[PDB]
Design a binder for these strands. Structure first.
Ligand SMILES: [Mg+2]
Ligand SMILES: [Mg+2]
Ligand SMILES: [Mg+2]
Ligand SMILES: [Mg+2]
Ligand SMILES: [Mg+2]
Ligand SMILES: [Mg+2]
Ligand SMILES: [Mg+2]
Ligand SMILES: [Mg+2]
Ligand SMILES: [Mg+2]
Ligand SMILES: [Mg+2]
Ligand SMILES: [Mg+2]
Ligand SMILES: [Mg+2]
Ligand SMILES: [Mg+2]
Ligand SMILES: [Mg+2]
Ligand SMILES: [Mg+2]
Ligand SMILES: [Mg+2]
Ligand SMILES: [Mg+2]
Ligand SMILES: [Mg+2]
Ligand SMILES: [Mg+2]
Ligand SMILES: [Mg+2]
Ligand SMILES: [Mg+2]
Ligand SMILES: [Mg+2]
Ligand SMILES: [Mg+2]
Ligand SMILES: [Mg+2]
Ligand SMILES: [Mg+2]
Ligand SMILES: [Mg+2]
Ligand SMILES: [Mg+2]
Ligand SMILES: [Mg+2]
Ligand SMILES: [Mg+2]
Ligand SMILES: [Mg+2]
Ligand SMILES: [Mg+2]
Ligand SMILES: [Mg+2]
Ligand SMILES: [Mg+2]
Ligand SMILES: [Mg+2]
Ligand SMILES: [Mg+2]
Ligand SMILES: [Mg+2]
Ligand SMILES: [Mg+2]
Ligand SMILES: [Mg+2]
Ligand SMILES: [Mg+2]
Ligand SMILES: [Mg+2]
Ligand SMILES: [Mg+2]
Ligand SMILES: [Mg+2]
Ligand SMILES: [Mg+2]
Ligand SMILES: [Mg+2]
Ligand SMILES: [Mg+2]
Ligand SMILES: [Mg+2]
Ligand SMILES: [Mg+2]
Ligand SMILES: [Mg+2]
Ligand SMILES: [Mg+2]
Ligand SMILES: [Mg+2]
Ligand SMILES: [Mg+2]
Ligand SMILES: [Mg+2]
Ligand SMILES: [Mg+2]
Ligand SMILES: [Mg+2]
Ligand SMILES: [Mg+2]
Ligand SMILES: [Mg+2]
Ligand SMILES: [Mg+2]
Ligand SMILES: [Mg+2]
Ligand SMILES: [Mg+2]
Ligand SMILES: [Mg+2]
Ligand SMILES: [Mg+2]
Ligand SMILES: [Mg+2]
Ligand SMILES: [Mg+2]
Ligand SMILES: [Mg+2]
Ligand SMILES: [Mg+2]
Ligand SMILES: [Mg+2]
Ligand SMILES: [Mg+2]
Ligand SMILES: [Mg+2]
Ligand SMILES: [Mg+2]
Ligand SMILES: [Mg+2]
Ligand SMILES: [Mg+2]
Ligand SMILES: [Mg+2]
Ligand SMILES: [Mg+2]
Ligand SMILES: [Mg+2]
Ligand SMILES: [Mg+2]
Ligand SMILES: [Mg+2]
Ligand SMILES: [Mg+2]
Ligand SMILES: [Mg+2]
Ligand SMILES: [Mg+2]
Ligand SMILES: [Mg+2]
Ligand SMILES: [Mg+2]
Ligand SMILES: [Mg+2]
Ligand SMILES: [Mg+2]
Ligand SMILES: [Mg+2]
Ligand SMILES: [Mg+2]
Ligand SMILES: [Mg+2]
Ligand SMILES: [Mg+2]
Ligand SMILES: [Mg+2]
Ligand SMILES: [Mg+2]
Ligand SMILES: [Mg+2]
Ligand SMILES: [Mg+2]
Ligand SMILES: [Mg+2]
Ligand SMILES: [Mg+2]
Ligand SMILES: [Mg+2]
Ligand SMILES: [Mg+2]
Ligand SMILES: [Mg+2]
Ligand SMILES: [Mg+2]
Ligand SMILES: [Mg+2]
Ligand SMILES: [Mg+2]
Ligand SMILES: [Mg+2]
Ligand SMILES: [Mg+2]
Ligand SMILES: [Mg+2]
Ligand SMILES: [Mg+2]
Ligand SMILES: [Mg+2]
Ligand SMILES: [Mg+2]
Ligand SMILES: [Mg+2]
Ligand SMILES: [Mg+2]
Ligand SMILES: [Mg+2]
Ligand SMILES: [Mg+2]
Ligand SMILES: [Mg+2]
Ligand SMILES: [Mg+2]
Ligand SMILES: [Mg+2]
Ligand SMILES: [Mg+2]
Ligand SMILES: [Mg+2]
Ligand SMILES: [Mg+2]
Ligand SMILES: [Mg+2]
Ligand SMILES: [Mg+2]
Ligand SMILES: [Mg+2]
Ligand SMILES: [Mg+2]
Ligand SMILES: [Mg+2]
Ligand SMILES: [Mg+2]
Ligand SMILES: [Mg+2]
Ligand SMILES: [Mg+2]
Ligand SMILES: [Mg+2]
Ligand SMILES: [Mg+2]
Ligand SMILES: [Mg+2]
Ligand SMILES: [Mg+2]
Ligand SMILES: [Mg+2]
Ligand SMILES: [Mg+2]
Ligand SMILES: [Mg+2]
Ligand SMILES: [Mg+2]
Ligand SMILES: [Mg+2]
Ligand SMILES: [Mg+2]
Ligand SMILES: [Mg+2]
Ligand SMILES: [Mg+2]
Ligand SMILES: [Mg+2]
Ligand SMILES: [Mg+2]
Ligand SMILES: [Mg+2]
Ligand SMILES: [Mg+2]
Ligand SMILES: [Mg+2]
Ligand SMILES: [Mg+2]
Ligand SMILES: [Mg+2]
Ligand SMILES: [Mg+2]
Ligand SMILES: [Mg+2]
Ligand SMILES: [Mg+2]
Ligand SMILES: [Mg+2]
Ligand SMILES: [Mg+2]
Ligand SMILES: [Mg+2]
Ligand SMILES: [Mg+2]
Ligand SMILES: [Mg+2]
Ligand SMILES: [Mg+2]
Ligand SMILES: [Mg+2]
Ligand SMILES: [Mg+2]
Ligand SMILES: [Mg+2]
Ligand SMILES: [Mg+2]
Ligand SMILES: [Mg+2]
Ligand SMILES: [Mg+2]
Ligand SMILES: [Mg+2]
Ligand SMILES: [Mg+2]
Ligand SMILES: [Mg+2]
Ligand SMILES: [Mg+2]
Ligand SMILES: [Mg+2]
Ligand SMILES: [Mg+2]
Ligand SMILES: [Mg+2]
Ligand SMILES: [Mg+2]
Ligand SMILES: [Mg+2]
Ligand SMILES: [Mg+2]
Ligand SMILES: [Mg+2]
Ligand SMILES: [Mg+2]
Ligand SMILES: [Mg+2]
Ligand SMILES: [Mg+2]
Ligand SMILES: [Mg+2]
Ligand SMILES: [Mg+2]
Ligand SMILES: [Mg+2]
Ligand SMILES: [Mg+2]
Ligand SMILES: [Mg+2]
Ligand SMILES: [Mg+2]
Ligand SMILES: [Mg+2]
Ligand SMILES: [Mg+2]
Ligand SMILES: [Mg+2]
Ligand SMILES: [Mg+2]
Ligand SMILES: [Mg+2]
Ligand SMILES: [Mg+2]
Ligand SMILES: [Mg+2]
Ligand SMILES: [Mg+2]
Ligand SMILES: [Mg+2]
Ligand SMILES: [Mg+2]
Ligand SMILES: [Mg+2]
Ligand SMILES: [Mg+2]
Ligand SMILES: [Mg+2]
Ligand SMILES: [Mg+2]
Ligand SMILES: [Mg+2]
Ligand SMILES: [Mg+2]
Ligand SMILES: [Mg+2]
Ligand SMILES: [Mg+2]
Ligand SMILES: [Mg+2]
Ligand SMILES: [Mg+2]
Ligand SMILES: [Mg+2]
Ligand SMILES: [Mg+2]
Ligand SMILES: [Mg+2]
Ligand SMILES: [Mg+2]
Ligand SMILES: [Mg+2]
Ligand SMILES: [Mg+2]
Ligand SMILES: [Mg+2]
Ligand SMILES: [Mg+2]
Ligand SMILES: [Mg+2]
Ligand SMILES: [Mg+2]
Ligand SMILES: [Mg+2]
Ligand SMILES: [Mg+2]
Ligand SMILES: [Mg+2]
Ligand SMILES: [Mg+2]
Ligand SMILES: [Mg+2]
Ligand SMILES: [Mg+2]
Ligand SMILES: [Mg+2]
Ligand SMILES: [Mg+2]
Ligand SMILES: [Mg+2]
Ligand SMILES: [Mg+2]
Ligand SMILES: [Mg+2]
Ligand SMILES: [Mg+2]
Ligand SMILES: [Mg+2]
Ligand SMILES: [Mg+2]
Ligand SMILES: [Mg+2]
Ligand SMILES: [Mg+2]
Ligand SMILES: [Mg+2]
Ligand SMILES: [Mg+2]
Ligand SMILES: [Mg+2]
Ligand SMILES: [Mg+2]
Ligand SMILES: [Mg+2]
Ligand SMILES: [Mg+2]
Ligand SMILES: [Mg+2]
Ligand SMILES: [Mg+2]
Ligand SMILES: [Mg+2]
Lengths: 275, 48
RNA sequence: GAGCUAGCCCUGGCCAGGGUGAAGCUGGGGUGAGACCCAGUGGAGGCCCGAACCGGUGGGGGAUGCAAACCCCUCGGAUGA
RNA sequence: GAAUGCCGGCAUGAGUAACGAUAAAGAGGGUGAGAAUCCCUCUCGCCGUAAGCCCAAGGGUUCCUACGCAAUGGUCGUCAGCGUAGGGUUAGGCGGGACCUAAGGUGAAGCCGAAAGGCGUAGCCGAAGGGCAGCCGGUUAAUAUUCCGGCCCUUCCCGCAGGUGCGAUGGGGGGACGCUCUAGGCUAGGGGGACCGGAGCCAUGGACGAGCCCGGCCAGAAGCGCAGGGUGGGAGGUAGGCAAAUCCGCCUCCCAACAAGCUCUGCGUGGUGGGGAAGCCCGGGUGACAACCCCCCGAAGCCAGGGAGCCAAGAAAAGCCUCUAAGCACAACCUGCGGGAACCCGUACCGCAAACCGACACAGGUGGGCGGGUGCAAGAGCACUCAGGCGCGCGGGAGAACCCUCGCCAAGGAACUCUGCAAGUUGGCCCCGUAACUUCGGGAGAAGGGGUGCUCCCUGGGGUGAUGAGCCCCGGGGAGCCGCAGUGAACAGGCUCUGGCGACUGUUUACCAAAAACACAGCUCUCUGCGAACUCGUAAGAGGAGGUAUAGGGAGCGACGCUUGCCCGGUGCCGGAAGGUCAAGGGGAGGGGUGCAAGCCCCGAACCGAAGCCCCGGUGAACGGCGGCCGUAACUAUAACGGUCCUAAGGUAGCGAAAUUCCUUGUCGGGUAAGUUCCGACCUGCACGAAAAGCGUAACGACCGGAGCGCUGUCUCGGCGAGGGACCCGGUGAAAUUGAACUGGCCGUGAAGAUGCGGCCUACCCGUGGCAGGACGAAAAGACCCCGUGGAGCUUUACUGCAGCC
RNA sequence: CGAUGUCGGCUCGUCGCAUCCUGGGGCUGAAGAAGGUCCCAAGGGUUGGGCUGUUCGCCCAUUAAAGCGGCACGCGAGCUG
RNA sequence: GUGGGAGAGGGUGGUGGAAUUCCCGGAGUAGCGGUGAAAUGCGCAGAUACCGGGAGGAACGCCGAUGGCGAAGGCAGCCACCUGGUCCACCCGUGACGCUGAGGCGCGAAAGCGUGGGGAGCAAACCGGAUUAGAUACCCGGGUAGUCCACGCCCUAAAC
RNA sequence: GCCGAGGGUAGGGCCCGUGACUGGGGCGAAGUCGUAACAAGGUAGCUGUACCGGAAGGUGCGGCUGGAU
RNA sequence: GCGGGGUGGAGCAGCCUGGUAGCUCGUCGGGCUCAUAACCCGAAGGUCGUCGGUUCAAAUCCGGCCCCCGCAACCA
């Protein structure tokens, strides 16, 4: 669901908020949080190197388990579902029967009070983790690793899912969230199901201030600048671009491909994306 | 109105002070020249 | 040289008083169940009026100035980007 | 002798402007060579959410006292933040260090870079954050939570007694956290008292009174009481918290659970220790054996880590508790008691300012806490006033013009002017009432109107009490009094209709532009499979992001509604194992130099040979583009229709004399007595047009137009009045400028606008207040223009390079 | 060009006369009244408002008339902007 | 009520194969396609035609009928669950509890709209080729909404 | 002193007349353009809706027979 | 001021590179039709805006004048 407001202020009229119904615990688990070093988009030189960043809400970072092959065969109960400010997706607090506690990103359908497990033998049900080779071809999956033991890299954002297409030797064939068709190694762990909070994309920020809370400062158009600042700078009155639309740094910005052609992972991408 | 000089001892000693100058090639060079010119003070007096 | 100024980072602080009255909740009505309507409760908001505080709209004065940007009247924001 | 030359000296303007907030002064007395200016008294005025008081920064002896007045002080000076001298800052508990970590800084390991140096998990540094033990009074010319008095507390060392598996930089718990709102109960602070204490007062017509005036508390261990915070207890298993672990985590079980218990804190009481007014005698004495009580109001502070709701989801580390490991268990630790021990640095004074930042004793700037009373609906607003502090370091007169700030105005009422610019008007609360349109919130304080003081009588609900009295809060009804006037002073909207532009709150050219500009939610295109793209850096390393296509970069458009047409020939980008061209390289037909020679050396055709370009295709919310001439309809006029030429394709909807329309005040309509503007229309649109978006849109606007009501010194058209200047007298005393000057009018002349030449005319010498026509007045080596083979910023299919990428 | 401030308005005017009015005349296709046209005359006078930045012009209502020009297109050490 | 029946009646969740399209490997050569005839188009950069692999969406051939079901709109592979109407036999139960129906409320083909998916085939708009006096059509090659899914709107019909 | 004809101020409601200009409608007709419908009307017609075109109309989707053979 | 242009009735070629005037429509005569259109068959008409010059010869090259289209007209 998504919550609307009555138009009692001009900005409320459009603003929509998340429904937060799946949340059962309004406090992060202390032994799993640590402080987020805000950067402002500035690097170790101090330079802005990603423009327009800063001034958002303070955040405590939740330590997530992107391995899971860490604890094969030890089951865990789903103790709660929590809000995580560092992602789109929601999180799930697991209490292992081991006694150890961990977070994973919360799949859609997960129940508070159910059980999950990881390993070659896990039942193919929501929340379990297996090497890709043992998940049946055709079932949809998330939190997928890209190389074995390297951590879950793909399908991590709310509502996303990858899907297994077929197999070819040591490798399985995934259709990624973007529609790209890729070979991933069969020993790459993955978690059955899709990520939850799929209603995320229907959120209407509603006013300038909301973006500000998110730590996103205002973006200024090239066309509004001067030639020193930007290719689109200057001109008397408004002006069309007057050259191929360009970035602040001059490269072409409508259409121009930038993936390195000789990149070694090319042997593994079957079909570049779509749409 | 608010003018440009707004004194601050910690600001001062950290910015222009002897240990600041010593750490870097530019600062050392300053001390050299101020010593060769015969300046009485190599570094801004500031009481702490 | 960022003790002015601009942005960000860490850690503290501040915003008299009044007004309007969102959702929610409770009760009543309504219906097969509902949608919903009414009342009370409630206290939302880059909401309203206005001090501090932050500004600098119009006018006047000032013009070897009280001042290398000030003064008076008036005016904008004032829980928020 | 000139360089707007350089350094210095001294003139001119000139006894002129000015002497720094218009809060304001007067007299008496004293001191002294000298007094408007120092001290004292009395009177008057000003601040009081300060113009009072206390902290932090910064300043660094400015503090106190004595003795001084050359200079500093905008005048004066006997005074001083000034000169000379002497004195003055006292801590285990306040602040910082011998504690902790934050961004950041530094940096063993390690990585990188010609050198210099750049990075870097641990650690270390880093505070106005965490942590940690002192409260009230007295004393000094000057210090005080520091000395003294009283009552309290902390750590460290040693000893004694009891107790326990003791022991850590290692495990764990805790510390530990947002915003808004908010309960109960307290405290701080305040109001009243017919009650308690008090020197005294009875005026001037009255009052010897339940009269006036003054004051009625502060700190305090254990114990206790009231209000709150924190926290389940036991057992069994246990593969997790990088060793171990009785701890913590997980599972099962029994008792308990809005309780109690245990513990911590606030507030009250409390052994005791202090304070203690008005008034009148010289800071002190007295008041005084001072009293030290009841009631009400009441926090934003406290109990606190309290409670609730919301989304944007809200530091770390140590102290502290606990668990064990090496070890050690004659040790060690915990608890109680005692004795001993407890270092370094700050402390003076200013601190919204004459002591800080502004060259000044400068109308500016400067963070935190306290900030009393009454009244006005509230309040930190406003008027007055307490405590406290001031009258702003030139004065005395006069009563011109003119200036500033302010007050009022007959009749008119925007006729003023680019413009109602400015100034009137309106103005708080209560009640009645309120339109188009609308996104159903709004528009709305629309508009418009009534009420408002005081006195008496009657009555309703609430708080604290007790259910009552009293005190406090919120009302209702009736009858009357006075004035021109009752939010009687002060603070406190003028309104309406109608267009443009931007949806909106926001942002901007510090110091001539606040806007229609920027941003903005929202829409689209496009890149990116993650050692992402992209950005910074030679690199290492970083940001991106401890994110992962519902995510991140780039670009345009800019809520929302309805929409966004046709063109891919050129440019861009995308796709294209062909063909063409294509560098180094391979290859070596053939040729050359030299040697007696094998040999050495040089040129070198075909053919093989990347990206790029060519070439084939796609693509517009990619750069961009979206025709001409001629004819045609029962009269005209016009052209639905037709002809032909050209193109990659010939502007669709909607809009249109427009923020766009040249001709132009187009034409017509509306409004006005009259309208180059404004609104509504028409369309031969000089030169709209669809995300450099098109046409609309409620709400919003210190934006820019047009109109009307209200009301006004804006105007007819000016008048009078107030104060601060201007004027005069005493005191102090500048400035730009200045070739020298004994510096008149006219008509002429002159390098073409003459005080200075000619002719004539006029004119006794010198000042003062005034006005601005001239001295091509002052100021600025014209900012426009041109010139210089002068410079700088910006552009690109100018040239040539370089990084970057292929 | 080591600076001669620039439209219009306001304010204050002063001058020329090729006279808008008022005074004196000649001619008239001058009956009267009222005009036309030229001559003399610069003494005085020559309004208020709508539009526009406007000068100008147009318009409204009046008038004896609503004159045209010069003075650095008079006048910014006089104001507006 | 008791006991039975037929059915594409409705909702949810699954799942089967035929075919079209695109992609991949093979093999193969000079045309394929389309119409009245043609052109556009596609094709030596290797098409069509053929074999194998794979991806995805939509619609269910034979059964199929002059049939069945629903109040209407309408409903067609198959499987399970949930659910409605309706007929029959017995003559057991209630005892007129009935009929209709202004307003109301719900349902309501296609197209259309909102937010999000999905997109193989088809196809308004649009482009191109033909035809023609013209051809903003009929015919041919391309092609976007949409056609499909979820939720929410619209409420019209030669809804017969 | 109350009520009070009505006068005055302010804002609303319904109706009527009128208005530059504009939208289609009826009639007139001896005009221009095409030929959509009636025959299989030369693409069967009609239909709701949607997009488009000088105009009748066309096309998509679904529907009806009130469709010749 | 710079560039382009005038050719049967309409609209375009030919001009550069001198000798030679072409294309579609339209007009006229015939045909098909009851008739008209369309369609089919034949056919007329430009002395190339003018005046001048170069040449053996000028629509063509050069000059003058005329009319038309486009662009420019800036600091001021
Ligand atoms: Mg949900
Ligand atoms: Mg909403
Ligand atoms: Mg709401
Ligand atoms: Mg709602
Ligand atoms: Mg609103
Ligand atoms: Mg709004
Ligand atoms: Mg969300
Ligand atoms: Mg959210
Ligand atoms: Mg949720
Ligand atoms: Mg932690
Ligand atoms: Mg972090
Ligand atoms: Mg660093
Ligand atoms: Mg650095
Ligand atoms: Mg960036
Ligand atoms: Mg940034
Ligand atoms: Mg989350
Ligand atoms: Mg969004
Ligand atoms: Mg955030
Ligand atoms: Mg954004
Ligand atoms: Mg922007
Ligand atoms: Mg701009
Ligand atoms: Mg700009
Ligand atoms: Mg720069
Ligand atoms: Mg550049
Ligand atoms: Mg550039
Ligand atoms: Mg540009
Ligand atoms: Mg520009
Ligand atoms: Mg310009
Ligand atoms: Mg610009
Ligand atoms: Mg422009
Ligand atoms: Mg611009
Ligand atoms: Mg524009
Ligand atoms: Mg431009
Ligand atoms: Mg552009
Ligand atoms: Mg441009
Ligand atoms: Mg361009
Ligand atoms: Mg990879
Ligand atoms: Mg500062
Ligand atoms: Mg400091
Ligand atoms: Mg400091
Ligand atoms: Mg500092
Ligand atoms: Mg230093
Ligand atoms: Mg020395
Ligand atoms: Mg130095
Ligand atoms: Mg902080
Ligand atoms: Mg505030
Ligand atoms: Mg609630
Ligand atoms: Mg705000
Ligand atoms: Mg507000
Ligand atoms: Mg407000
Ligand atoms: Mg101002
Ligand atoms: Mg004003
Ligand atoms: Mg002021
Ligand atoms: Mg306000
Ligand atoms: Mg507010
Ligand atoms: Mg807030
Ligand atoms: Mg000389
Ligand atoms: Mg000089
Ligand atoms: Mg000089
Ligand atoms: Mg000199
Ligand atoms: Mg000099
Ligand atoms: Mg003088
Ligand atoms: Mg002065
Ligand atoms: Mg003074
Ligand atoms: Mg004053
Ligand atoms: Mg004196
Ligand atoms: Mg004296
Ligand atoms: Mg004195
Ligand atoms: Mg007060
Ligand atoms: Mg100093
Ligand atoms: Mg002192
Ligand atoms: Mg002296
Ligand atoms: Mg002095
Ligand atoms: Mg002074
Ligand atoms: Mg003396
Ligand atoms: Mg002094
Ligand atoms: Mg002590
Ligand atoms: Mg020590
Ligand atoms: Mg430290
Ligand atoms: Mg500290
Ligand atoms: Mg104490
Ligand atoms: Mg002392
Ligand atoms: Mg013992
Ligand atoms: Mg420990
Ligand atoms: Mg935390
Ligand atoms: Mg904190
Ligand atoms: Mg009180
Ligand atoms: Mg007290
Ligand atoms: Mg109590
Ligand atoms: Mg264990
Ligand atoms: Mg106590
Ligand atoms: Mg006393
Ligand atoms: Mg005594
Ligand atoms: Mg006694
Ligand atoms: Mg929290
Ligand atoms: Mg840390
Ligand atoms: Mg041992
Ligand atoms: Mg113990
Ligand atoms: Mg020491
Ligand atoms: Mg010390
Ligand atoms: Mg001290
Ligand atoms: Mg002082
Ligand atoms: Mg101040
Ligand atoms: Mg202060
Ligand atoms: Mg002070
Ligand atoms: Mg200064
Ligand atoms: Mg300075
Ligand atoms: Mg200075
Ligand atoms: Mg000073
Ligand atoms: Mg002073
Ligand atoms: Mg001052
Ligand atoms: Mg008041
Ligand atoms: Mg008030
Ligand atoms: Mg105020
Ligand atoms: Mg008082
Ligand atoms: Mg004074
Ligand atoms: Mg005088
Ligand atoms: Mg008057
Ligand atoms: Mg009026
Ligand atoms: Mg009036
Ligand atoms: Mg106006
Ligand atoms: Mg007022
Ligand atoms: Mg209205
Ligand atoms: Mg409404
Ligand atoms: Mg209104
Ligand atoms: Mg009274
Ligand atoms: Mg009064
Ligand atoms: Mg006042
Ligand atoms: Mg107001
Ligand atoms: Mg209006
Ligand atoms: Mg306009
Ligand atoms: Mg607009
Ligand atoms: Mg704007
Ligand atoms: Mg705006
Ligand atoms: Mg809008
Ligand atoms: Mg805005
Ligand atoms: Mg605001
Ligand atoms: Mg500026
Ligand atoms: Mg500015
Ligand atoms: Mg400046
Ligand atoms: Mg500036
Ligand atoms: Mg500005
Ligand atoms: Mg503004
Ligand atoms: Mg801007
Ligand atoms: Mg903008
Ligand atoms: Mg939009
Ligand atoms: Mg680089
Ligand atoms: Mg790195
Ligand atoms: Mg990171
Ligand atoms: Mg990311
Ligand atoms: Mg906007
Ligand atoms: Mg913008
Ligand atoms: Mg609308
Ligand atoms: Mg078109
Ligand atoms: Mg193109
Ligand atoms: Mg192209
Ligand atoms: Mg281009
Ligand atoms: Mg182009
Ligand atoms: Mg464009
Ligand atoms: Mg005709
Ligand atoms: Mg027009
Ligand atoms: Mg317009
Ligand atoms: Mg235009
Ligand atoms: Mg015009
Ligand atoms: Mg014009
Ligand atoms: Mg005119
Ligand atoms: Mg006119
Ligand atoms: Mg106007
Ligand atoms: Mg016209
Ligand atoms: Mg643009
Ligand atoms: Mg605004
Ligand atoms: Mg505005
Ligand atoms: Mg006046
Ligand atoms: Mg007066
Ligand atoms: Mg006066
Ligand atoms: Mg005298
Ligand atoms: Mg002389
Ligand atoms: Mg002259
Ligand atoms: Mg001269
Ligand atoms: Mg002369
Ligand atoms: Mg003379
Ligand atoms: Mg002479
Ligand atoms: Mg004379
Ligand atoms: Mg003068
Ligand atoms: Mg003057
Ligand atoms: Mg002069
Ligand atoms: Mg002169
Ligand atoms: Mg002059
Ligand atoms: Mg000057
Ligand atoms: Mg100057
Ligand atoms: Mg020079
Ligand atoms: Mg010069
Ligand atoms: Mg200059
Ligand atoms: Mg110059
Ligand atoms: Mg020039
Ligand atoms: Mg040159
Ligand atoms: Mg030269
Ligand atoms: Mg240059
Ligand atoms: Mg690149
Ligand atoms: Mg000049
Ligand atoms: Mg000069
Ligand atoms: Mg000058
Ligand atoms: Mg007569
Ligand atoms: Mg005569
Ligand atoms: Mg005269
Ligand atoms: Mg005269
Ligand atoms: Mg005018
Ligand atoms: Mg004019
Ligand atoms: Mg003149
Ligand atoms: Mg002038
Ligand atoms: Mg001026
Ligand atoms: Mg002027
Ligand atoms: Mg001058
Ligand atoms: Mg002058
Ligand atoms: Mg003046
Ligand atoms: Mg101006
Ligand atoms: Mg071949
Ligand atoms: Mg329907
Ligand atoms: Mg549809
Ligand atoms: Mg039928
Ligand atoms: Mg009457
Ligand atoms: Mg037909
Ligand atoms: Mg037909
Ligand atoms: Mg047409
Ligand atoms: Mg069509
Ligand atoms: Mg049907
Ligand atoms: Mg040619
Ligand atoms: Mg030829
Ligand atoms: Mg015929
Ligand atoms: Mg010849
Ligand atoms: Mg010839
Ligand atoms: Mg010839």
């Amino acid at each position: 669901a998504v919550k609307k407001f009555k138009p009692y202020t001009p900005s409320r009229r459009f603003m929509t908020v998340a429904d937060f119904s799946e949340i059962t615990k309004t406090e992060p688990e202390k032994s799993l949080v640590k402080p987020l070093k805000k950067t402002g988009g500035r690097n170790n030189q101090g330079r802005i190197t990603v423009r327009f960043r800063g001034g958002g809400h303070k955040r405590l970072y939740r330590i997530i388990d992107f391995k899971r092959w860490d604890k094969v065969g030890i089951p865990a109960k789903v103790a709660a579902i929590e809000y995580d400010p560092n992602r789109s997706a929601r999180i799930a607090l697991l209490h292992y029967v081991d006694g150890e506690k961990r977070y994973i990103i919360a799949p859609d359908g997960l129940q508070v009070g159910q059980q999950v497990v990881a390993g070659p033998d896990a039942p193919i049900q929501v929340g379990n983790a297996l090497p890709l080779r043992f998940i049946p071809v055709g079932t949809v999956v998330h939190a997928v690793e890209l190389e074995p033991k390297k951590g879950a890299k793909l399908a991590r954002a709310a509502g996303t899912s990858a899907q297994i297409q077929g197999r070819e030797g040591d490798y399985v064939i995934l259709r990624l969230p973007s529609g790209e068709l890729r070979k991933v190694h069969g020993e790459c762990y993955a978690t059955v199901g899709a990520v939850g909070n799929a209603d995320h994309k229907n959120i209407v920020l509603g006013k300038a201030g909301r973006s500000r809370w998110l730590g996103r400062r205002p973006h200024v158009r090239g066309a509004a600048m001067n030639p020193v600042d930007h290719p689109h700078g200057g001109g008397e009155g408004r002006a069309p671009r007057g050259r191929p639309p360009a970035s602040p740094w001059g490269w072409q910005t409508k259409g121009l491909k930038t993936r390195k052609r000789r990149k070694p992972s090319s042997r593994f991408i079957i079909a570049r994306r779509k749409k | 109105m608010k003018r440009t000089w707004q004194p601050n001892r910690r600001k001062r000693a950290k910015t222009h002070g002897f240990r600041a100058r010593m750490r870097t090639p530019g600062g050392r060079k300053v001390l050299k020249r101020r010593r060769q010119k015969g300046r009485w003070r190599l570094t801004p007096a500031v009481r702490k």
